């Protein structure tokens, strides 16, 4: 019985490969040969945020590009003021093991989670209390790798149980579940329209999902190791992924295959985070070498390096307007580059 | 512009209050010590946690020794895969790797070799390179019982045991049968060989023969943490 299903799967995979192969008459790199080089890019640390006692894992830029979110193993969730450097809130967390955090688009709520397998939604707009817990989204069977808000009442979460789910904050029940990964799910990325989202896993592959239908649409297997990070291209028709392979790869949903590969001989370390500039021409990817590299999205050449961190760059974030680049590291120091 | 000055003064007062609270939390955090409990599924970690105490992904058990507080974390409902979440315990004071030394349908799997490979993988992990590990060789009574029974797995699954000789540095307690001491010291030497091959000096291991019912377990952890922090201080002042 199995042989009459595995063979069909192999035939379908071969058909998909043949269809993709016949579509590659010219690559992005070949036609982009006439594009003018970006040239060397230099950035300077404009701000440094201090106060965290332990290593920082994740951060999220606010919709106004003014406030920041930082999560550390010390149990403190601090809301920063990127312009004045002042700390607005410092929420003590019941569980010190938090691996991700998110700021709601309206700014009324904040979220975090980690090894506790529970996502806690914090309300910053309570009438008298400065901060309090609103709901605990229990139900996952593993550590929460990433989470992102869709609306004030809907949040998408990722866990190491090879499953992702959509949670209704008002009731706390899983409105939709996403399955298909054979390994842990590392990161999530919401599309500009928020209808679709793409998740990276340890399967050396990436998958695209629909929140309204909860079923996979496309599968990409260009990488060779775990996908640490994923981010959509600003137009929403393509995305880039960071993996332990030490090579970033660009994928287009319509081309349905890898377009560009970013790597060099001297770079052999894993990639922790990946982000896009507002125009999408420059790739900002964090590396275990304690520095970030700027890769040309089109020419696939390094434009600059953001060095100065004393420990692993755990996360990387770019404002909505793209005027500033915030980088987090295990040293507990947040550095803003511009 | 009073509307701006008032807001900036309120934001500075709030910042000062948050900074004072965070400073107090800093003393609280520095006073506290953190520990990680690891090991195989069938090991005695559960009984050790239970005796220390007298659906969630992690459990908390705090014990106080000599007025210094220790925090020990036990992994709860987590996927068997460990490579991606073990990295979160790089800053822990020490790792407690309780491994069962049982040497026996019943032999559903040989978890001694699996434990050795897991220890090697943890030892070679890039981000755990500065995290010392305390090695509790648990289940000594069962090891002795099986050695006396003449059906131990040590001789068959580890052919090098035939040429193995008891180290001169061994300090077996009086009344222990020579075969039991030889087997337990061979088990020790396996982990020491795995751990002593690095040579970088960023690691160290603390083997400890113990039983889950032993009350001295708590004191051993305190002594090992004391030694680890003392070595860290020696390193800081260039003494090492």
């Amino acid at each position, epitope marked *: 019985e199995l042989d009459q299903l595995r063979q069909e799967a192999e035939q379908l995979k071969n058909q998909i490969r043949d269809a993709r192969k016949a579509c590659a008459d010219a690559t992005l790199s070949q036609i982009t040969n006439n594009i003018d080089p970006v040239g060397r890019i230099q950035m300077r640390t404009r701000r440094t945020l201090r106060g965290h006692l332990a290593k920082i894992y994740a951060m999220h830029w606010g919709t106004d590009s003014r406030l920041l979110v930082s999560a550390s193993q010390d149990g403190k969730l601090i809301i920063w003021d990127s312009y004045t450097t002042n700390k607005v809130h410092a929420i003590p967390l019941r569980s010190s093991w938090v691996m991700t955090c998110a700021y709601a688009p309206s700014g009324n709520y904040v979220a975090c989670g980690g090894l506790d397998n529970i996502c806690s939604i914090y309300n910053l707009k309570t009438r008298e209390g400065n901060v309090r817990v609103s709901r605990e989204l229990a139900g996952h069977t593993g550590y929460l790798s990433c989470c992102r808000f869709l609306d004030d009442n809907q949040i998408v979460t990722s866990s190491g149980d090879t499953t992702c789910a959509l949670w209704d904050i008002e009731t706390g029940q899983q409105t939709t579940t996403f399955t298909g990964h*054979t*390994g842990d799910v590392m990161s999530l990325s919401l599309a500009p329209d928020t209808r679709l989202f793409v998740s990276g896993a*340890c*399967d*050396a*592959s990436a998958k695209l999902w629909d929140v309204r239908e909860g079923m996979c649409r496309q599968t990409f*297997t*260009g990488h*060779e*190791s*775990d996908i640490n990070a994923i981010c959509f291209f600003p137009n929403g028709n393509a995305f880039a992924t960071g993996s*332990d*392979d030490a090579t970033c790869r660009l994928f287009d949903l319509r081309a349905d295959q890898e377009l560009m590969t970013y790597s060099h001989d001297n770079i*052999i370390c*894993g990639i922790t985070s990946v982000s896009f500039s507002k125009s999408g021409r420059l790739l900002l990817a964090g590396y275990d070498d304690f520095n970030c590299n700027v890769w040309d999205a089109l020419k696939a050449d390094r434009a600059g390096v953001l060095a100065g961190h004393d420990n692993r760059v755990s996360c990387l974030g770019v404002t909505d307007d793209g005027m500033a680049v915030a980088t987090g590291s295990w040293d507990s120091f947040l550095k803003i580059w511009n | 512009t009073e509307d701006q000055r008032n807001e900036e003064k309120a934001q500075r007062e709030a910042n000062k209050k948050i900074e004072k609270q965070l400073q107090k939390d800093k003393q609280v955090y520095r006073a506290t010590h953190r520990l990680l409990l690891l090991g195989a599924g069938e090991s005695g970690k559960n009984t050790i946690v239970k005796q220390m105490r007298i659906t969630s992904g992690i459990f908390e058990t705090k014990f106080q020794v000599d007025k210094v507080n220790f925090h020990m974390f036990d992994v709860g409902a987590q*996927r*068997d*895969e*460990r*490579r991606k979440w073990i990295q979160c315990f790089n800053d822990v004071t020490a790792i407690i790797f309780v491994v069962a030394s049982s040497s026996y349908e019943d032999n*559903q*799997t*040989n978890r001694l*070799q*699996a434990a050795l*490979k897991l220890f*090697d*993988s*943890i*030892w*070679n*992990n*890039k981000w755990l390179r500065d995290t010392s590990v305390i090695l509790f060789l648990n289940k000594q009574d069962l090891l002795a019982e099986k050695v006396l029974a003449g059906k131990s797995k040590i001789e*068959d*699954y*580890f*052919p*090098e045991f035939a040429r193995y000789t008891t180290p001169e540095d061994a300090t077996p307690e009086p009344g222990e049968d020579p075969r039991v001491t030889r087997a337990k010291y061979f088990i020790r030497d396996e982990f020491l060989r795995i751990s002593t091959a690095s040579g970088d000096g960023r690691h160290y291991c603390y083997p400890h023969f113990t039983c889950a019912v032993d009350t001295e377990n708590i004191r051993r952890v305190f002594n090992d943490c004391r030694d680890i922090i003392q070595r860290m201080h020696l390193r800081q002042y260039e003494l090492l």
Partner: nanobody
Amino acid sequence: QVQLQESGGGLVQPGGSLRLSCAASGFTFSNYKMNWVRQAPGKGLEWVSDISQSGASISYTGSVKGRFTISRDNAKNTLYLQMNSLKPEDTAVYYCARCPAPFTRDCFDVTSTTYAYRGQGTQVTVSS
């Protein structure tokens, strides 16, 4: 895309010699440490042997030490497992395994649940 294809197997009498192969493809073979895994009927996964990047360092489990030989070829991009004097207890399905990251000495391919970087394996049986 990472793909592993184990080759060889069958039923042989105790003491027979069997040659297993792993035509590793779709990835830089030289950059990853390679290990062999097996699973006897009614029992969980167990590590068999491992080989380093260039093969300068090799190791075997005590129960199969000497009997089994692990070798790899970079020009052909294939891994071998030469079995000799097979005992009846050696019967098991053998998998070709690779640990996730390159340029690292620590592998994690003894996972019980589905593991992304191991092949489908081949059934090897030894009985009188």
